[PDB]
Amino acid sequence: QNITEEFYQSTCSAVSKGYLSALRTGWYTSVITIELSNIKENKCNGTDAKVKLIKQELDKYKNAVTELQLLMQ
């Protein structure tokens, strides 16, 4: 144990001594990019023709990406 406490009755206060510091004086930036492992619709029919998981799952994404493209200006 490094850290200790002193109590001063003169001022009725207590100090907590024994800390080492790091004072932030600037920023370091980095540009991370990432790519989409894209799915190509597979053409053929499933058990239920009225169900296109792959298309909807992309429109779920596409439309999400679109909603973010609207926040930058």
Partner 1 sequence: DNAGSVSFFPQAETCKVQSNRVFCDTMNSLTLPSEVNLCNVDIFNPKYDC
Partner 2 sequence: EVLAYVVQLPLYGVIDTPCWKLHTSPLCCLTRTDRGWYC
Partner 3 sequence: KIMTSKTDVSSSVITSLGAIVSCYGKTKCTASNKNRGIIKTFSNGCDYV
- What's the full length of the chain, in residues? 73
β-strand partners of 39:
none
Residue of 18, 41, 52, 56 interacting with partner 1 (CB under 8 A): 18
Print the binding letters for residues 26-55 with partner 2: x by CB under 8 A, - otherwise: xxxxxxxxxxx-x-----------------
The amino acid sitting at 49 is A
Report, in Å, the least distance between residue 24 CB and partner 1.
5
CA-CA distances (angstroms) from residue 31 to 12, 26, 28, 38? 50, 17, 10, 22
Which chain residues interact with partner 1 by CB under 8 A?
2-3, 8, 10-11, 13, 15, 18-25
